[PDB]
Amino acid sequence: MKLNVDGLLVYFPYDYIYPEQFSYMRELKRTLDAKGHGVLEMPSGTGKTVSLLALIMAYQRAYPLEVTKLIYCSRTVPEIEKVIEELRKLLNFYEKQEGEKLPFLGLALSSRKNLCIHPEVTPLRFGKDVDGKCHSLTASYVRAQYQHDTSLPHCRFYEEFDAHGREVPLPAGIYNLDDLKALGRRQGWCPYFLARYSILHANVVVYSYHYLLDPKIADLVSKELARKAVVVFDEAHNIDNVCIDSMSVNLTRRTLDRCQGNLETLQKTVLRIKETDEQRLRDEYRRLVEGLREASAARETDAHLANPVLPDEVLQEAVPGSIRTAEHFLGFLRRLLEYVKWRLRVQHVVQESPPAFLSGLAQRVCIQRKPLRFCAERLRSLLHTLEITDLADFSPLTLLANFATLVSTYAKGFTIIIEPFDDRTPTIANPILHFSCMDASLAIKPVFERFQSVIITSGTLSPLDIYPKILDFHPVTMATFTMTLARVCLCPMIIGRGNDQVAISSKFETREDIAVIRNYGNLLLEMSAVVPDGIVAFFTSYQYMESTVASWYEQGILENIQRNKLLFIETQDGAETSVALEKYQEACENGRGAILLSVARGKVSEGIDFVHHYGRAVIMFGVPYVYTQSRILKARLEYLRDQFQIRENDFLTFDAMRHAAQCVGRAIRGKTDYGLMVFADKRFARGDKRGKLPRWIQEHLTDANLNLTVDEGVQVAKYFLRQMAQPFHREDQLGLSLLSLEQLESEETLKRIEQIAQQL
Amino acid sequence: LEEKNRMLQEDPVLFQLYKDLVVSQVISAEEFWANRLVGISAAFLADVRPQTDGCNGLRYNLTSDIIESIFRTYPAVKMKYAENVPHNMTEKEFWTRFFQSHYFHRDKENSNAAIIKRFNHHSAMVLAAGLRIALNLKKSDRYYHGPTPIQSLQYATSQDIINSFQSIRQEMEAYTPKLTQVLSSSAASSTITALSPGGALMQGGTQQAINQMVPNDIQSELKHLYVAVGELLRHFWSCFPVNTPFLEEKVVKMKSNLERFQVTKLCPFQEKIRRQYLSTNLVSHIEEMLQTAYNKLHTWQSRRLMKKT
Amino acid sequence: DMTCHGEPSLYNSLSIAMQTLKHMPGHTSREVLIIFSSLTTCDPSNIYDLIKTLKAAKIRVSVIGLSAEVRVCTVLARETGGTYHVILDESHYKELLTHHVSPPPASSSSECSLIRMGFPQHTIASLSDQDAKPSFSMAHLDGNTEPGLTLGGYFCPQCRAKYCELPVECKICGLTLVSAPHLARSYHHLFPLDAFQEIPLEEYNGER
Numbered sequence A: 001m002k003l004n005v006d007g008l009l010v011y012f013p014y015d016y017i018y019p020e021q022f023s024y025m026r027e028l029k030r031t032l033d034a035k036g037h038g039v040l041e042m043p044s045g046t047g048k049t050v051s052l053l054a055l056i057m058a059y060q061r062a063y064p065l066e067v068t069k070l071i072y073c074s075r076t077v078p079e080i081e082k083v084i085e086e087l088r089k090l091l092n093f094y095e096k097q098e099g100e101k102l103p104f105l106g107l108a109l110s111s112r113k114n115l116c117i118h119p120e121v122t123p124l125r126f127g128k129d130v131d132g133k134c135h136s137l138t139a140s141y142v143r144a145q146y147q148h149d150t151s152l153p154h155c156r157f158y159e160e161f162d163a164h165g166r167e168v169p170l171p172a173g174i175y176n177l178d179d180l181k182a183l184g185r186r187q188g189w190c191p192y193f194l195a196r197y198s199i200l201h202a203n204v205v206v207y208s209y210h211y212l213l214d215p216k217i218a219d220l221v222s223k224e225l226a227r228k229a230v231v232v233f234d235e236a237h238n239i240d241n242v243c244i245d246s247m248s249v250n251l252t253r254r255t256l257d258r259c260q261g262n263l264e265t266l267q268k269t270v271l272r273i274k275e276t277d278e279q280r281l282r283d284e285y286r287r288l289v290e291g292l293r294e295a296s297a298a299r300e301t302d303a304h305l306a307n308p309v310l311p312d313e314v315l316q317e318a319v320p321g322s323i324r325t326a327e328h329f330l331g332f333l334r335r336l337l338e339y340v341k342w343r344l345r346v347q348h349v350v351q352e353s354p355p356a357f358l359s360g361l362a363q364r365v366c367i368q369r370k371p372l373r374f375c376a377e378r379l380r381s382l383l384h385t386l387e388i389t390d391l392a393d394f395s396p397l398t399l400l401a402n403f404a405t406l407v408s409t410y411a412k413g414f415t416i417i418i419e420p421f422d423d424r425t426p427t428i429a430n431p432i433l434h435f436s437c438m439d440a441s442l443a444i445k446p447v448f449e450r451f452q453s454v455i456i457t458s459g460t461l462s463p464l465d466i467y468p469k470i471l472d473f474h475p476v477t478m479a480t481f482t483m484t485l486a487r488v489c490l491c492p493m494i495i496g497r498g499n500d501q502v503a504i505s506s507k508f509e510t511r512e513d514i515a516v517i518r519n520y521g522n523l524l525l526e527m528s529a530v531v532p533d534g535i536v537a538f539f540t541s542y543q544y545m546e547s548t549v550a551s552w553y554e555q556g557i558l559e560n561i562q563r564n565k566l567l568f569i570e571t572q573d574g575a576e577t578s579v580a581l582e583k584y585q586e587a588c589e590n591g592r593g594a595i596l597l598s599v600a601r602g603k604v605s606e607g608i609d610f611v612h613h614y615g616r617a618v619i620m621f622g623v624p625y626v627y628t629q630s631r632i633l634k635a636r637l638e639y640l641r642d643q644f645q646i647r648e649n650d651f652l653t654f655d656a657m658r659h660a661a662q663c664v665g666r667a668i669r670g671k672t673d674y675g676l677m678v679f680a681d682k683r684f685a686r687g688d689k690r691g692k693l694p695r696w697i698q699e700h701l702t703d704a705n706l707n708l709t710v711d712e713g714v715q716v717a718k719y720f721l722r723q724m725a726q727p728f729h730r731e732d733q734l735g736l737s738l739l740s741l742e743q744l745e746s747e748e749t750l751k752r753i754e755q756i757a758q759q760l
Numbered sequence B: 001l002e003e004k005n006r007m008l009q010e011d012p013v014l015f016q017l018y019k020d021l022v023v024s025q026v027i028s029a030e031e032f033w034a035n036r037l038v039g040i041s042a043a044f045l046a047d048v049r050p051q052t053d054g055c056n057g058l059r060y061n062l063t064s065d066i067i068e069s070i071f072r073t074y075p076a077v078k079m080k081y082a083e084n085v086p087h088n089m090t091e092k093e094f095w096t097r098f099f100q101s102h103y104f105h106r107d108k109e110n111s112n113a114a115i116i117k118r119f120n121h122h123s124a125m126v127l128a129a130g131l132r133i134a135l136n137l138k139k140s141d142r143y144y145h146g147p148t149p150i151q152s153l154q155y156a157t158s159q160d161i162i163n164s165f166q167s168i169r170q171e172m173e174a175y176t177p178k179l180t181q182v183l184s185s186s187a188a189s190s191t192i193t194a195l196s197p198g199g200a201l202m203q204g205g206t207q208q209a210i211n212q213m214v215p216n217d218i219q220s221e222l223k224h225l226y227v228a229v230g231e232l233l234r235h236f237w238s239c240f241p242v243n244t245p246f247l248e249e250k251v252v253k254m255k256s257n258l259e260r261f262q263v264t265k266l267c268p269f270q271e272k273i274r275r276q277y278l279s280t281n282l283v284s285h286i287e288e289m290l291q292t293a294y295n296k297l298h299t300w301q302s303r304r305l306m307k308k309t
Numbered sequence C: 001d002m003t004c005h006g007e008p009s010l011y012n013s014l015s016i017a018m019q020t021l022k023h024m025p026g027h028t029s030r031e032v033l034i035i036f037s038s039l040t041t042c043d044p045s046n047i048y049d050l051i052k053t054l055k056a057a058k059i060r061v062s063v064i065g066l067s068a069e070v071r072v073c074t075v076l077a078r079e080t081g082g083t084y085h086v087i088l089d090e091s092h093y094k095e096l097l098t099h100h101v102s103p104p105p106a107s108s109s110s111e112c113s114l115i116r117m118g119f120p121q122h123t124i125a126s127l128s129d130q131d132a133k134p135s136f137s138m139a140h141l142d143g144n145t146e147p148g149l150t151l152g153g154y155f156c157p158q159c160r161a162k163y164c165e166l167p168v169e170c171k172i173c174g175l176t177l178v179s180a181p182h183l184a185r186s187y188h189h190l191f192p193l194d195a196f197q198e199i200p201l202e203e204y205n206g207e208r
């Protein structure tokens, strides 16, 4: 279908389009015309990604200079595959409409674990082992020796790509990860290196958050990225947590043991090579004194251990002579490790600022911050100059060096937490250091300042103003697209009153109540006896869920629930959890009722999506407040309050509501998809708690359904099912929730579309 | 042998029919018997409980249905029963052990993990055991005159019918109601005579109690012979239509069987009427059906011969 | 007055129906109606294989659920060409049943064969006549109670089989003994009565 949006032609691949999709396209176009960052919220399952891709392709075809190259950021690999498939469908539609193949190239990026073809590296279960083995087989220095010695271990896959794959770029098109692997096998090349080389050619590059948000990985992509490119963030409601985790550092005693062992082995190897060939050390010293520009810019293939976390200004300066010598830096690392262990020997939790710890280190270890800024670069040069292949054993060493460098440079917004005892089980000595980062905006700071614009969207964006504060930027447009339904496919209900009128809550004080456990059991039994096969129940914590399951088993109610519908409960291990999920889905597809019991912060809420017959019923047991004992959470709350006047309780409530909406928002795939939403808590009746829900979801939350009982919820569920089980036709959607080709041209429809979405 | 004999004991009439067919040499037992020829739920443990009676009674009631369900769901129980019962331990002893074993009474992080793993294994076992045209008419008038044949719709003459149509149009134009002229005593008497019992309109009347004229034993024997004849004729017409030579031979065998049945069973039954001199022609229907079958077969033989001429 | 217990086994019931309708002629339509109260069933084998078997046998199955829609039943009804519905109330139950009374449209795969049928009269014998032969009905022989010795009745024109009930296909020769009104009883389906034009009285300037 051809769409006229403000004079710009859009090749919509489907015969029908939602009015909200048209408003989404119009808002994206208006944001593009200002070349500024923006925040929009669209309900899931409405094909917002399709509209985004269509408008971006229209911009690229009409104005190649406006959109030089497209950047897309994702969360999980299956989402990447879905985006690739949808873009392939759009390109096929373009080819069918025009009759010619467009000069359009799309590329999806992932790790070597998802892009290695070497048979020896295939059975490896871990990506870091894969990376180490690949570097061992594809080291630049090793490659030259292998040129003089074929019998040396090597990866022919990269060899043929280097020999042949560089000259001829891949033809314009859209290639999936398995498609990339097949192309590499056909050509004898490795899809990872070939894809990275061909990123410069692809109009669209799609990958995950970690590949660019992490400063350690930012230059692996941003080097081939210009200023006219536009970045897209889909379902980035937890992007702040991603930035914090990427900038967080954890160290334990076993890490210290491994680092000490590897340091001793490295010193032995240094002495051995000095006995064998001392001139390597002198040549490395020559490189260091002459400058790091010669070393960094001459070998892009050794980017395995790149640390672009430092600002580009810092990279220019050379390492001071106090640690330029290899043995001097060995003593430096040894003293640093001993001081770290001594400071970690504290028997109580210590809260510190990075400048305070740096001052303490300077006072005790006689180490200045400026030399510690270049700690990783010297470590990189030392590791590279010793022909080291097994860098996997160096992981604690590199981690500690990078942490020390972070202490030397990044201080504001960071908190040092020293906890020698576990939060759950303090009785076991578990010395852990947390260098927690409280400024996520810095991680997103360069992206705003380098590219033409940045696109951020998600289906759970209830507070529109918190994100500009968190990311420290001003989106040009902030509009929430309300959902218009000809058929009410969602029935969100709140049940805070039990059968015995017991007040239902999920506070940790009230989590141990047996009465709430029995009320939850009765509600689950009634839901299984009433609601269709698909049942998913999200608890607040794994331990509480396990205790509740044990109580239900002891109470004997769980047997009746199993008789009604089959029971499946996830555990910590993903592998067994994946098998449980597969069994649940198979049972749902085999007509036998299957019930899933998961946690709001488990893997289910992260990358598991539900088909209409899978997301039939989702019940959230209480407001999922994070366990407050986390001092990292405490430190983040205190820092945000002291830097943005943000209430800690407000942040906790917002996080819990966002997690709940993420748990619930995946139950609908479209207008024809209807699902049931249940919230078993009276706390949701709080206006601040109720009011922090996404607009498209909270809009259908009728006030008469606020704080119902089990019986009322069951009866309303039966009524909703019977109403929504009536057969429905796509023709009924025309003019009310769906638009035909002629309906678009109606100006009354245009006014209705403009009234549907609102900017705040 | 034993299997076939038990079927006869289930249906004494069939055994009587088999006696009349094979024992009397009318048909062979081979041709006789040529004509003659569960879901799984997850509650199999939750619902099943040790039955405790009023006063100290363990009514286990070890039905095979529950045991088979457990074996299908739990091959481990099957293996233990096969490797132990009844040598290592008796079956009741094994069931008592199962009741008292910790595997049944599964009822603390280790306990929670054990319960979750057992539930997952049970679900996996249950799932694994579950595996093993637009139409447009042409001639609408056919519906207006359907299965009814052409009636004698005789039409009137020339326009003089209109004159007759005028006559009534003038005859009833000036009409006065009449009461005496409607009926007469003679007309009423004639109508009653027509309606009088035994009259022209009152055709027939009471009939003869044929139930008493046919003895109940003769009634039952007639029913049995009717069943036999119906089975034989069903076999006969089952071959029809004849498209293969095998059907011809089968029909010849069936005709021979019908002839032997008439000779052996029908005629002494016929004489049983004739000795009792029953005036009811009960046999006449059977004779008509047999002659109809004979005529059909002979006519088809004639048709096949003409095709072969 | 039965006892409702256990769980439904749709697989076994569909297998029984398929076995029963396996030997039916192709021109005759194979239709199955299922009333599904519970939302879960136990199947000893894969049901999708049974779905393939029904599709190959060209059997139409329609399901009217009671609580809510079942995805597996929905797929089964859609693939078999049947219709899936959900009960709203007793009136809606009656509406759905009445809708399913009407014959379904014939698919492209439906056969068109020239079937032969016989139409005997009600041959009644009078005891005054020497040609009155009372005989037990073949259908009445099927029952345990002693069959009624009826003087006359309906005799098969093909094999003189005697039946007291019509329209019933003859058991002996397989001939379907019918009557003309029985055939004409479905003629209205051939020519449905179209809906009339609705005009309010004030807008209609004609007869009152």
Ligand code: SF4
Residues within 6 Å of the ligand: A112, A115, A116, A117, A118, A121, A133, A134, A135, A137, A138, A155, A156, A157, A158, A190, A191, A192
């Ligand atoms: S060069 Fe390619 S195939 Fe060889 S180990 Fe590295 S990623 Fe795997």
Ligand SMILES: [Zn+2]
Residues within 6 Å of the ligand: C156, C157, C158, C159, C160, C161, C170, C171, C172, C173, C174, C175
């Ligand atoms: Zn017949």
